Each structure stands twice: as structure tokens, then as C-alpha cells.
Design an enzyme around this catalytic site. Sequence first.
Site, PDB file in Angstrom:
ATOM      1  CG  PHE A  79      -1.802   1.209   1.394  1.00  0.00           C
ATOM      2  CD1 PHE A  79      -2.345   1.494   2.630  1.00  0.00           C
ATOM      3  CD2 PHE A  79      -2.021   2.115   0.373  1.00  0.00           C
ATOM      4  CE1 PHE A  79      -3.083   2.635   2.859  1.00  0.00           C
ATOM      5  CE2 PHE A  79      -2.763   3.261   0.590  1.00  0.00           C
ATOM      6  CZ  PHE A  79      -3.309   3.534   1.831  1.00  0.00           C
ATOM      7  CD  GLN A  82       1.335   8.448   7.465  1.00  0.00           C
ATOM      8  OE1 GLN A  82       0.521   7.576   7.187  1.00  0.00           O
ATOM      9  NE2 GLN A  82       1.012   9.550   8.131  1.00  0.00           N
ATOM     10  CG  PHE A 132       1.133   8.542   1.514  1.00  0.00           C
ATOM     11  CD1 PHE A 132       0.405   9.631   1.964  1.00  0.00           C
ATOM     12  CD2 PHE A 132       0.725   7.867   0.376  1.00  0.00           C
ATOM     13  CE1 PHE A 132      -0.740  10.060   1.315  1.00  0.00           C
ATOM     14  CE2 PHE A 132      -0.429   8.272  -0.282  1.00  0.00           C
ATOM     15  CZ  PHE A 132      -1.153   9.363   0.183  1.00  0.00           C
ATOM     16  CG  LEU A 141      -5.252   6.961  -0.695  1.00  0.00           C
ATOM     17  CD1 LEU A 141      -3.833   7.029  -0.172  1.00  0.00           C
ATOM     18  CD2 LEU A 141      -6.270   7.151   0.418  1.00  0.00           C
ATOM     19  CG  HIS A 145      -4.438  11.706   0.848  1.00  0.00           C
ATOM     20  ND1 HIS A 145      -4.034  12.003   2.132  1.00  0.00           N
ATOM     21  CD2 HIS A 145      -5.443  10.811   0.987  1.00  0.00           C
ATOM     22  CE1 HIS A 145      -4.756  11.325   3.007  1.00  0.00           C
ATOM     23  NE2 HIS A 145      -5.624  10.591   2.335  1.00  0.00           N
TER      24      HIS A 145
END
Length: 297
Positions: A79, A82, A132, A141, A145
Site C-alpha cells: 500500500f 508513511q 507517504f 486516495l 490527498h
Amino acid sequence: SHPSPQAKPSNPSNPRVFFDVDIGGERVGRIVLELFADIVPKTAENFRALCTGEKGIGPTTGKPLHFKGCPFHRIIKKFMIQGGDFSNQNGTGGESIYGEKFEDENFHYKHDKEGLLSMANAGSNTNGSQFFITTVPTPHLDGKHVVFGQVIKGMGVAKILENVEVKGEKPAKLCVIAECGELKEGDDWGIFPKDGSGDSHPDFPEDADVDLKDVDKILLISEDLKNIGNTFFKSQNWEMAIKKYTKVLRYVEGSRAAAEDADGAKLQPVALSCVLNIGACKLKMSDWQGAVDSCLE
């Protein structure tokens, strides 16, 4: 929201910055990042300055406005990676160069692939210093983001980071930005291993400035590497010897993957099309003979 750039970099004027990554006190290597100043200049600049430390001390945290020594506190395989919480090192802290939180500049790029740099946040317009790096496409996302750069060297280092042992999502070994900064046009990438071995080749062959399909050049590199390994071998430095030996295998595998991919991308299609055209040609001819048969028949 559009596809992320494919070219590395997308644009030569965009800032290039780096992270030297250590895990369990071991230097893993360099990640080099392109910052998409051209698209999200304000988001790019915050991150760029956090790489140099040049803004000094942060007013709301009291820490340097700097990623130097900042660990990656939350890592989820398949994924993202971060980090950026340089003040609380656990995701509740950090701060931007403009004040704690600045706004979502725009969502022009999609998280459409691995190696993309995007702003962590706690809702609309809460951008700080946390960010990230995706290790896969993360479309859920999008629009939530801001994507503002991508990896252009060292994705293999990101890969190693992606795979550390974790407890929950917290890495078991300390994962940290040992060093960071900005590259001037023309500076050296600093992506050869910083081990004093005289090894000038990037840790991952896809980052080298060489056409990997050029077999003679890969063997020159492999011979160098193997000489360096033999030297460690002569010094009884077995682990360092295995490192170098393992690296030629990486270069040989990179060369093969390169040849294969290029073939699949470029030659296979055109060969497919030629066989298709031949089948077409075979029909035309059988038809012209069928026609001629009946006639002269």
C-alpha cells in the site's frame, strides 16, 4: 485528476531531492524524488525546504523544519510508506513551512502507480510535513490527498522499506531518514553504495545510466563488481563479498528483464501485426485462385 507522469523526471526544472534510508541502523540506500513544482508549487516547496532544513526551527513544534532523522512510523506492505512526523514520530505531529497546516493545493494527479509522493492529512486542508510514498496504485486516495512528486531513483530502496517487519503497521526495526537534501542540476545522484568499496554503480540497475540490454556493457559492470567482491573475499570480508556478488546477479537479472520487456512492448506487437497481415494475404490468394479455378473451369 490525471495520470501521473511516466517520464523520470517529468520535467527537468522540477526540484530533485533525496533521502538516504537506514533500517535497523543499516544504510539501505538512496531514494531520489522529483517534486512536481510545475503542478503544485506550494506543496513542492514545503517538502523541498523540509529536505534542506533551510527554514530553521518550527514555530509550533520547536523542532527543526527538517526530515533529517525523521523515521517512517507507519508502513503497510502493498500500500504505502508513511513518514515525515519529525516532531512526534508517530503520525500526530510535524508541521509545514507556512504554519502547522496548509490547504490542499490541488488534486491534479492521480495515485495511479507505485513510487508516487503524496501528502498525508487529517482531512481537507490539513497538510503538514507528513507524506507517504505509494508502493502500488492507490486510487481510493484520489482527490483526498495531494500528489506532488514521484520516485526517480531508488525505488528498490522503497521496496526494501516496504518489506520490513512490522508490529501492526509500526516497523519492528527503526526506519529512518538518515540524511536528506536537494540536488543541484548536475550534482551526482549519490546512488552508488556509500561503502568505500570503489563501487560506482547504482544499487539498482534500472537506475544506472546504461541501456541494460547492452550485454557487453553489463558484463563490464559485472566484472568490475565481481572484482570488487573478490577483493572483499581476499580481505575475509565475506558479507561484503556476497553483497557485491549478489549485485552482479541483480544487474544480470535487470538486463534480462530489460530485454524481455522491450521485446514485449515493441517487437511482439509488430510481429503480431505481421502474422495477422499474412493471414489476410493468404485469404486474398486463396480467393484469387478459387475465382480462377471456376473460370478456367
